[PDB]
Amino acid sequence: VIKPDMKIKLRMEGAVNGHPFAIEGVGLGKPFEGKQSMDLKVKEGGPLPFAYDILTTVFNRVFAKYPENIVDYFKQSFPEGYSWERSMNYEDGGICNATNDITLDGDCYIYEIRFDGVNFPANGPVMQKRTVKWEPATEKLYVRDGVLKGDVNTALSLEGGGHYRCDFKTTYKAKKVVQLPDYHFVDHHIEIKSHDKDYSNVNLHEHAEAHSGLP
Amino acid sequence: VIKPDMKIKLRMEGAVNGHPFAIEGVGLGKPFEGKQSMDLKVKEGGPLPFAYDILTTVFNRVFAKYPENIVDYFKQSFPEGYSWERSMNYEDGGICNATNDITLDGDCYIYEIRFDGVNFPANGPVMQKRTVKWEPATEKLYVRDGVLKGDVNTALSLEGGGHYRCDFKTTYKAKKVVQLPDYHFVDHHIEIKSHDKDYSNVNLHEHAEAHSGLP
Amino acid sequence: VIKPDMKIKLRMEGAVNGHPFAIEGVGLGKPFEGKQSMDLKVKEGGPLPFAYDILTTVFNRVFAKYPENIVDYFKQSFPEGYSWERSMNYEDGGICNATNDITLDGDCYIYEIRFDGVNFPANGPVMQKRTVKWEPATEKLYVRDGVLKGDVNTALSLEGGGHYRCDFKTTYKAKKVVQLPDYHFVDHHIEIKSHDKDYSNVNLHEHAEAHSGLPELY
Amino acid sequence: VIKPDMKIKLRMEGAVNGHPFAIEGVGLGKPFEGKQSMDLKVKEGGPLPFAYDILTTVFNRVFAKYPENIVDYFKQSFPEGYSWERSMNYEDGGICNATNDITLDGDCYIYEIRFDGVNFPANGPVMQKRTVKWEPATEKLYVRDGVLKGDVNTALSLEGGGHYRCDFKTTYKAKKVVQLPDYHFVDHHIEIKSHDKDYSNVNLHEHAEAHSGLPMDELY
Secondary structure, three states: OOOOOEEEEEEEEEEEOOEEEEEEEEEEEEOOOOEEEEEEEEEEOOOOOOOOHHHHOOOOHHHOEOOOOOOOHHHHOOOOOEEEEEEEEEOOOOEEEEEEEEEEEOOEEEEEEEEEEEOOOOOOOOOOOOEEEEOOEEEEEEEEOOEEEEEEEEEEEEOOOOEEEEEEEEEEEEOOOOOOOOOEEEEEEEEEEEEOOOOOEEEEEEEEEEEOOOO | OOOOOEEEEEEEEEEEOOEEEEEEEEEEEEOOOOEEEEEEEEEEOOOOOOOOHHHHOOOOHHHOEOOOOOOOHHHHOOOOOEEEEEEEEEOOOOEEEEEEEEEEEOOEEEEEEEEEEEOOOOOOOOOOOOEEEEOOEEEEEEEEOOEEEEEEEEEEEEOOOOEEEEEEEEEEEEOOOOOOOOOEEEEEEEEEEEEOOOOOEEEEEEEEEEEOOOO | OOOOOEEEEEEEEEEEOOEEEEEEEEEEEEOOOOEEEEEEEEEEOOOOOOOOHHHHOOOOHHHOEOOOOOOOHHHHOOOOOEEEEEEEEEOOOOEEEEEEEEEEEOOEEEEEEEEEEEOOOOOOOOOOOOEEEEOOEEEEEEEEOOEEEEEEEEEEEEOOOOEEEEEEEEEEEEOOOOOOOOOEEEEEEEEEEEEOOOOOEEEEEEEEEEEOOOOOOO | OOOOOEEEEEEEEEEEOOEEEEEEEEEEEEOOOOEEEEEEEEEEOOOOOOOOHHHHOOOOHHHOEOOOOOOOHHHHOOOOOEEEEEEEEEOOOOEEEEEEEEEEEOOEEEEEEEEEEEOOOOOOOOOOOOEEEEOOEEEEEEEEOOEEEEEEEEEEEEOOOOEEEEEEEEEEEEOOOOOOOOOEEEEEEEEEEEEOOOOOEEEEEEEEEEEOOOOOOOOO
């Protein structure tokens, strides 16, 4: 179903602090190597008045390298696909709600993303655009009443030396009945390789590998 | 500009757990009585698979009775109007993000509402439709960085006696420079007086009175 | 069982950010009229390096004026008494855990209080003492699994202005089987009347009344 | 100052839901292999009416294997030592506040722990003792206002399935001026190897290793 080589197509519609925007992207990646890359383009609502880094983790766990001992819930879910729902909590009250419906058409993954952020203070690092990079993150994946859950508590490094924490809460629902994995982790590293000035064009890279902890 | 009798026109567009919907309403109210009433109709995405009660607190603090000891920020902001954002944090992980842009057209208040809820468990009271009503609530409205904020922790009474808590975090932004009030309260009471089976037609009643607390 | 006048004697043993301290108190109040006052003296660990305002809300819902229409869980629980636990989460990461065992000895209420605060930043208003007063607060009380719970979301007023928020979560356990009230509220107003300069002696007043939310001249 | 063989002496006294207890322990570590071991004993307030697992993560980041690429804040603090504070937020409202002042006496680490848990429901996995083990954890360490902070988000496994989440927030304060590290991680694993029937005697082990996240297997 899934080759070592797939393509990505996505459109994200949303609003941050009530003001709408839209982004389209095309990208590519390798599911067995856990790596993906994409090019993002702002279509509506640009220039964006908020930090672009609050969107990068919304721009697909099929691009995670899974060992044999860990059940791969996302590669099993195809060709039917899966969707995910997520709440992002920033330590100063900012809230981001995001959804992604992932389907597969041949060799291309298609995303239907919806994003909504509220309560970002105007003097905060997101509205002042004082963010630099997201630190590498560890995700906890576990089953709870028949669904797969994902929790991440990371931080954004602030242009200055500071760190801006965020808590992720994800729910993963496959379109067909698949086997559910056990408690495991997925390590992430997302990186902005290139943009212009107001982020109307963004080159985004991600690297993810699943593991089973220290023991 | 503020009339003893005002009407409301509103359209809400949103999604709960990724599934879109749209609702329109018309109503009227007495801003100096702190009372308002409206008729809401589902236009898209019906029948709703979630409890309708999670939307009623999103369908305007101008309908709050304000005493002269407290600065009335919401009646002061017209005819330019004001907007508010809100995150609703339920105790089982469900998160709802809502925005409202309120303008004034003659004697009619126009709401442009966007709603988005995620991570509502399928076995929880919102998706299982086991909510009865909202309990009466008190909000504290206070200034932080020159903007008005509102905090509520209320609960929904469940079919069987239990209570399902929610915490509100609202940011109120007036369109023009307005006078900021001091730390005060607003008591509220929202009630669904009539509805259809699947809530395609809902009559919603709300009563609010501002005060400055125990002395 | 409860007279129109009751006395208070209390002992607090605790710590903030790991450094111990101690406070004893004597007081008096009117349970039917929701008013109480006490004089607290610091015994150990003074002068206190933290804002005194984080403890005053730990220094009795029996001193809350209850209407006849709402069941009083605390006045009903006597003469055996009740105990309560509380977690306080300030918006800056500061966490306070408090427990209180309330007994009745004649006409005097006796408290056994334990206080522990952690994760208070050295640059914050609690460690640097920039608190002025608690704003008036409302508490919601509801039953959950046979016990009474109390949630309050209040704030502290700051020296230069602004507010410093705190979230309360209280559990009330009566010692005997009493019956549980319905979802109701209690309005609070706590105030430090007089104190010296390191708060080794503090005069504290509180006023509390229960009600049932937003609802005649006769 | 930090030897390949260290001993542990500890006393923890606190209360869960208002009911006091006291625990004594003795142990030994290998501060360079990130492994520690200890045997613990209940002295007051036993038999414990709560799950013992809510205390095990309170029984020393000096027993974490630190590579040279990451600055070691905890090995720098000895022999004068450091202290830490922690709030543990369970997902059903249980809250635990714990503090530990660690000193160094010759070749032995001395702990003075104070623990306080409240709002634990009587029908919950802690008071009903339905916890099995802690899952492996990753902690995030970072500097804020000149001190080192620690964030952990793990779960506890329960009898019959499922997980019971808890969120850790730790503050590390060295007693003397040390060099502050950059954003890094420490992987943890807690396990009770042997215990009694009433958990009056517990043998506890830990293994901790620091790293810097998703980056060595060049095969040479």
